[PDB]
Scaffold this active site. Structure first.
Site, PDB file in Angstrom:
ATOM      1  N   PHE B 179       0.846  -1.181   0.000  1.00  0.00           N
ATOM      2  CA  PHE B 179       0.000   0.000   0.000  1.00  0.00           C
ATOM      3  C   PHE B 179       0.883   1.232   0.000  1.00  0.00           C
ATOM      4  O   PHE B 179       1.657   1.433   0.940  1.00  0.00           O
ATOM      5  CB  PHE B 179      -0.940   0.034   1.213  1.00  0.00           C
ATOM      6  CG  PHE B 179      -1.918   1.168   1.163  1.00  0.00           C
ATOM      7  CD1 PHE B 179      -1.563   2.428   1.619  1.00  0.00           C
ATOM      8  CD2 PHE B 179      -3.170   0.987   0.613  1.00  0.00           C
ATOM      9  CE1 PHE B 179      -2.451   3.490   1.536  1.00  0.00           C
ATOM     10  CE2 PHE B 179      -4.080   2.048   0.526  1.00  0.00           C
ATOM     11  CZ  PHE B 179      -3.718   3.303   0.991  1.00  0.00           C
ATOM     12  N   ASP B 288       9.348   3.005   1.357  1.00  0.00           N
ATOM     13  CA  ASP B 288       8.195   3.737   1.862  1.00  0.00           C
ATOM     14  C   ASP B 288       8.111   3.507   3.371  1.00  0.00           C
ATOM     15  O   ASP B 288       7.741   2.420   3.832  1.00  0.00           O
ATOM     16  CB  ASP B 288       6.919   3.278   1.109  1.00  0.00           C
ATOM     17  CG  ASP B 288       5.666   3.990   1.567  1.00  0.00           C
ATOM     18  OD1 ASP B 288       5.673   4.601   2.659  1.00  0.00           O
ATOM     19  OD2 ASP B 288       4.651   3.908   0.834  1.00  0.00           O
ATOM     20  N   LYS B 319       2.648  10.736   8.223  1.00  0.00           N
ATOM     21  CA  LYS B 319       1.974  10.253   9.449  1.00  0.00           C
ATOM     22  C   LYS B 319       2.600  10.764  10.754  1.00  0.00           C
ATOM     23  O   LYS B 319       2.419  11.914  11.107  1.00  0.00           O
ATOM     24  CB  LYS B 319       1.929   8.721   9.467  1.00  0.00           C
ATOM     25  CG  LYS B 319       0.889   8.138   8.500  1.00  0.00           C
ATOM     26  CD  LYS B 319       0.756   6.625   8.680  1.00  0.00           C
ATOM     27  CE  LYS B 319      -0.105   5.966   7.606  1.00  0.00           C
ATOM     28  NZ  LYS B 319      -1.555   6.314   7.733  1.00  0.00           N
ATOM     29  N   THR B 343       1.910  23.828  -4.719  1.00  0.00           N
ATOM     30  CA  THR B 343       1.636  25.110  -4.070  1.00  0.00           C
ATOM     31  C   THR B 343       2.309  25.209  -2.709  1.00  0.00           C
ATOM     32  O   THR B 343       2.998  26.184  -2.422  1.00  0.00           O
ATOM     33  CB  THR B 343       0.121  25.370  -3.885  1.00  0.00           C
ATOM     34  OG1 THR B 343      -0.516  25.459  -5.163  1.00  0.00           O
ATOM     35  CG2 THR B 343      -0.104  26.680  -3.157  1.00  0.00           C
TER      36      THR B 343
HETATM   37  C1  LIG Z   1       2.855   2.719   3.760  1.00  0.00           C
HETATM   38  C2  LIG Z   1       1.985   3.865   3.314  1.00  0.00           C
HETATM   39  N1  LIG Z   1       2.347   4.550   2.214  1.00  0.00           N
HETATM   40  C3  LIG Z   1       1.613   5.579   1.774  1.00  0.00           C
HETATM   41  C4  LIG Z   1       0.460   5.950   2.446  1.00  0.00           C
HETATM   42  C5  LIG Z   1      -0.332   7.109   1.893  1.00  0.00           C
HETATM   43  O1  LIG Z   1      -0.355   8.205   2.807  1.00  0.00           O
HETATM   44  P1  LIG Z   1      -1.620   9.198   2.815  1.00  0.00           P
HETATM   45  O2  LIG Z   1      -1.863   9.658   1.392  1.00  0.00           O
HETATM   46  O3  LIG Z   1      -2.814   8.445   3.353  1.00  0.00           O
HETATM   47  O4  LIG Z   1      -1.259  10.352   3.719  1.00  0.00           O
HETATM   48  C6  LIG Z   1       0.044   5.257   3.581  1.00  0.00           C
HETATM   49  C7  LIG Z   1      -1.219   5.706   4.301  1.00  0.00           C
HETATM   50  N2  LIG Z   1      -1.808   4.729   5.199  1.00  0.00           N
HETATM   51  C8  LIG Z   1      -3.083   4.325   5.016  1.00  0.00           C
HETATM   52  C9  LIG Z   1      -3.611   3.225   5.569  1.00  0.00           C
HETATM   53  S1  LIG Z   1      -5.120   2.879   4.927  1.00  0.00           S
HETATM   54  C10 LIG Z   1      -5.403   4.510   4.320  1.00  0.00           C
HETATM   55  C11 LIG Z   1      -6.275   4.526   3.103  1.00  0.00           C
HETATM   56  O5  LIG Z   1      -6.078   5.394   2.215  1.00  0.00           O
HETATM   57  O6  LIG Z   1      -7.191   3.681   3.064  1.00  0.00           O
HETATM   58  C12 LIG Z   1      -4.013   5.109   4.109  1.00  0.00           C
HETATM   59  C13 LIG Z   1       0.836   4.202   4.018  1.00  0.00           C
HETATM   60  O7  LIG Z   1       0.499   3.477   5.120  1.00  0.00           O
HETATM   61  C1  LIG Z   2      -6.041  25.279 -11.350  1.00  0.00           C
HETATM   62  C2  LIG Z   2      -5.186  24.460 -10.411  1.00  0.00           C
HETATM   63  N1  LIG Z   2      -5.501  23.162 -10.239  1.00  0.00           N
HETATM   64  C3  LIG Z   2      -4.792  22.380  -9.423  1.00  0.00           C
HETATM   65  C4  LIG Z   2      -3.700  22.894  -8.732  1.00  0.00           C
HETATM   66  C5  LIG Z   2      -2.921  21.969  -7.820  1.00  0.00           C
HETATM   67  O1  LIG Z   2      -2.973  22.430  -6.472  1.00  0.00           O
HETATM   68  P1  LIG Z   2      -1.757  22.020  -5.476  1.00  0.00           P
HETATM   69  O2  LIG Z   2      -1.511  20.546  -5.629  1.00  0.00           O
HETATM   70  O3  LIG Z   2      -0.521  22.785  -5.897  1.00  0.00           O
HETATM   71  O4  LIG Z   2      -2.225  22.416  -4.091  1.00  0.00           O
HETATM   72  C6  LIG Z   2      -3.340  24.227  -8.888  1.00  0.00           C
HETATM   73  C7  LIG Z   2      -2.138  24.754  -8.107  1.00  0.00           C
HETATM   74  N2  LIG Z   2      -1.526  25.946  -8.667  1.00  0.00           N
HETATM   75  C8  LIG Z   2      -0.250  25.956  -9.067  1.00  0.00           C
HETATM   76  C9  LIG Z   2       0.263  26.933  -9.824  1.00  0.00           C
HETATM   77  S1  LIG Z   2       1.815  26.559 -10.289  1.00  0.00           S
HETATM   78  C10 LIG Z   2       2.104  25.336  -9.048  1.00  0.00           C
HETATM   79  C11 LIG Z   2       3.047  24.252  -9.493  1.00  0.00           C
HETATM   80  O5  LIG Z   2       2.858  23.083  -9.101  1.00  0.00           O
HETATM   81  O6  LIG Z   2       4.032  24.561 -10.209  1.00  0.00           O
HETATM   82  C12 LIG Z   2       0.703  24.842  -8.671  1.00  0.00           C
HETATM   83  C13 LIG Z   2      -4.101  25.018  -9.743  1.00  0.00           C
HETATM   84  O7  LIG Z   2      -3.808  26.336  -9.936  1.00  0.00           O
END
Ligand SMILES: Cc1ncc(COP(=O)(O)O)c(CNc2csc(C(=O)O)c2)c1O
Ligand SMILES: Cc1ncc(COP(=O)(O)O)c(CNc2csc(C(=O)O)c2)c1O
Ligand code: FES
Lengths: 461, 461
Positions: B179, B288, B319, B343
């Site tokens: 995961f 990871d 986490k 952002t």
């Molecule tokens: C090993 C490992 N790698 C990546 C992730 C993703 O982190 P988040 O995007 O949830 O913050 C997780 C997040 N843990 C998790 C457990 S179940 C839950 C889910 O989305 O169902 C998310 C992780 O345990």
């Molecule tokens: C229309 C629109 N859609 C999605 C996003 C993604 O938001 P974040 O993941 O950055 O929070 C953005 C974020 N804006 C953005 C401008 S340049 C920056 C970059 O990643 O370079 C991110 C957005 O303007």
């Protein structure tokens, strides 16, 4: 709640920023860094750096600061003993929400729900907002096709190993010039700049042209109608074509104004007809308001200008909204839990801040203010355009969401650099545009202050 | 700092939780909600719900609360006037970092950097940590192949429209049972449960078997060696196979202990050899530690148990670390800016909290404590396994990162439900396992509190 005006001491970045930039560059590529900031001393529209320069900030952290720096109402929030828990006890919101979770949502996001969308899920940023909007759309589309029946054994087994029919070959249609985020789903629908895209694996999804309007609008009405009509036709042709390729378009994503791609506008008529095309072909219509949302165009959500009771199926947001997430129609509600999910699903502390932000926006009528201050800014830009046609062209905007083009990238960059040293922070977009993203406490007199500073810049340029 | 034991008033969820769950279910699917919580009254190892129930929390918000609820040291941080700006002025970190950015990183993340990894980029969650690690790896691999040649004109063209060669057909190798998150890139490497994967488009990337150890380990020494050796062979064959498919494996991602897929362990020897395979074929080795990281295995990062000066190329976290991000080797540093970007790139308020968390972990010797409290817990689970073989099997763990199997999903869920009503919150994983993710202030006496409660439950089951 702010300063009298800008106040410059050094060139920017100054010596203290350059030292910090050197330090940071040891542990990561820090070439993107503009300068280092003193947020503690920043107030309202004014950002203070570590060299003590005080600049009028018309970029607002890539359009993510809603009611200015160090806002007194937010200061009060952090000072209240009852709010300490929300900052130090972050919940796994999907399974263990805080007691006030629903009521805080009533006070914030639910109080500004788009028409026709009763459902809301929260997310921590724009990218996961869009990614999960995609997934919501994919499972909705599959739900239509399979009806009220269970997952098949073949589907359940093949999805675990990234195979059809468990993993469908659905597509999301996006537009050239679009920006929707950087995670690999988002990125497939992003078509902003090569440096965002190059060397990263993608999806074979359809990419439609976004209208490129000709200015001044008054002189190119017919040409611009023809341009929008052409784009609409290519959208429909793409939908048909990808259905035949067995890569069915489950959804269409678009920004109401394309930001990173160069502040590309289109008429409300275009979006109304785009909405219709989406519905006609059974495509979910996904509106990305991560950057246009939060009121700077004069209405809380930019799509409100379209005047539709049924503006979209899904709408994502972030930035000014403090938390990310997406509203959606009841029919897009996931059928089972744990399909749209992650550890945190936002952060209650951001919801806490957002409720007070929405309270300020309403009590101080900041939507009207953005319309008004934006009119002042746009009027001034049109004037400077007339007076300096060799530097300024395609002046365009809605509310304070304004922009113009320069002859080329070097002039664009030089103008930003000069403005910054003169006490005004401006953003660039596209290869040669300059954009405005002022906070919602940007007023008439700030617009005048900028215009008068930039006027003398152009005179000396 | 903590209560002295659980205190139950009602069934869980109680009437006030059920009312709040009904309200939330109007605006979104709320079927995953366990109960609603009073975080203000929660303390240390104990979670208090809105019905006044006080539970020993051994799940800690999906393993994300590092030093318990309402920690007095974190309380005092939020109370400091000088920290108010950090909570209400959130920066676009990639361009406008606060003055104290590097120093606060020195106090926190850099003070626990993995061996051999001088680079650090911050992210707001586990998913975008892993997504950007993939992208860092893809860019690195392409950089290997094009040497000192610049971006070709063809690549710059095709990448904008989701086409090769600008968008390469590189793959990330992942393991069955893994995961790694929910966004579409992450998700392709996730192989935990069908409900996480079904109806979502994916990538054709190689999927290797993760060793399934047999217990007791001491009675399956030869078998477990052969199992691990088998899995390693299949990994190497996959890398070769996918090179032929012109889908070159640029990286390998793995958890030091697979969590969601059912707390699956493998020997330190297995991981050392897997690392060697990765380097041998020029694959980046991505570890990871989003769930294993932050101390509960007895070492700050679980990979530290392997004993390598060169344990990996990239390592992601989130986490317990409050913020996400990834450490990586210098050679993986992006060549140009704006390729790894979004952002917010995290949140300085999480870094503020994390610096104090790491200080507490060090001063209170909590790594060693987790190894001790974990041994006491494991010893008691083994006792329960001997006394109740009709219900408990495959007891396993490292530090407090422990788990065991039940005979089927139905019994698994019943035991969790009963434990909760008896004052202990447990998590499940896989089809029929029960897991432990205690906070770092979980002590040997909390282990015995749980063990005595669960002993009584098993006697009456
Ligand atoms: C090993 C490992 N790698 C990546 C992730 C993703 O982190 P988040 O995007 O949830 O913050 C997780 C997040 N843990 C998790 C457990 S179940 C839950 C889910 O989305 O169902 C998310 C992780 O345990
Ligand atoms: C229309 C629109 N859609 C999605 C996003 C993604 O938001 P974040 O993941 O950055 O929070 C953005 C974020 N804006 C953005 C401008 S340049 C920056 C970059 O990643 O370079 C991110 C957005 O303007
Ligand atoms: S993808 Fe949105 S916070 Fe990580």
């Amino acid at each position: 709640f702010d300063y009298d005006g800008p106040l410059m001491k050094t060139e920017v970045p100054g010596p203290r920023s350059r030292e910090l930039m050197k330090q940071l560059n040891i542990i990561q590529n820090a070439e993107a860094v503009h300068f280092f900031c003193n947020y503690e001393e920043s107030r309202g529209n004014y950002l203070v750096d570590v060299d003590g320069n005080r600049m009028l900030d018309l970029y607002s952290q890539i359009s993510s600061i809603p009611i200015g720096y160090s806002h007194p109402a937010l200061v009060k929030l952090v000072q209240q003993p009852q709010n300490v828990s929300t900052f130090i006890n972050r919940p796994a919101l999907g399974i263990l929400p805080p007691e006030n979770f629903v009521e805080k949502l009533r006070e914030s996001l639910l109080s500004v729900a788009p028409k026709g969308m009763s459902q809301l899920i929260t997310m921590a940023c724009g990218s996961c907002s869009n990614e999960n909007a995609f997934k919501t759309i994919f499972m909705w589309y599959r739900s239509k096709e399979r009806g009220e029946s269970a997952f098949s054994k073949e589907e359940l087994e093949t999805c675990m190993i990234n195979q059809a029919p468990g993993c469908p070959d659905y597509s999301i249609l996006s537009f050239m010039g679009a920006f929707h985020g950087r995670t690999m789903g988002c990125l497939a629908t992003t078509h902003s700049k090569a440096i965002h895209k190059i060397d990263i694996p993608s999806f074979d999804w359809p990419i439609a042209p976004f209208p490129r309007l000709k200015y001044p609008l008054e002189e190119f009405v017919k040409e611009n109608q023809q341009e929008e009509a052409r784009c609409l036709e290519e959208v429909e042709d793409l939908i048909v074509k990808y259905r035949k390729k067995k890569k069915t378009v489950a959804g269409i994503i678009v920004e109401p104004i394309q930001s990173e791609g160069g502040d590309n506008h289109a008429s409300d008529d275009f979006f109304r007809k785009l909405r219709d095309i989406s519905r006609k072909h059974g495509c979910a219509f996904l509106v990305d308001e991560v950057q246009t949302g939060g009121g700077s165009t004069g209405k809380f959500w930019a799509h409100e200008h379209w005047g539709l009771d049924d503006p979209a199926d899904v709408m994502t947001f972030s930035k000014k909204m403090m938390t990310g997430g997406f509203f959606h129609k009841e029919e897009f509600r996931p059928n089972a839990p744990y399909r749209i999910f992650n550890t945190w699903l936002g952060d209650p502390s951001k919801n806490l801040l957002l409720a007070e932000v929405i309270n300020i926006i309403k009590r101080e009528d900041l939507l009207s203010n953005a319309a008004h201050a934006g009119k002042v800014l746009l009027t001034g830009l049109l004037d400077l355009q007339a007076r300096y046609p060799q530097f300024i062209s395609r002046v365009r905007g809605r509310g304070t969401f304004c922009s113009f083009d320069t002859p080329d990238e070097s002039i664009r960059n030089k103008l930003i650099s000069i403005a910054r040293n003169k006490g005004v922070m401006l953003g660039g977009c596209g290869d040669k545009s300059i954009r405005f993203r002022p906070t919602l406490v940007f007023r008439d007199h700030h617009a005048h202050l900028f215009l008068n500073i930039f006027s003398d810049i152009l005179a000396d340029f």
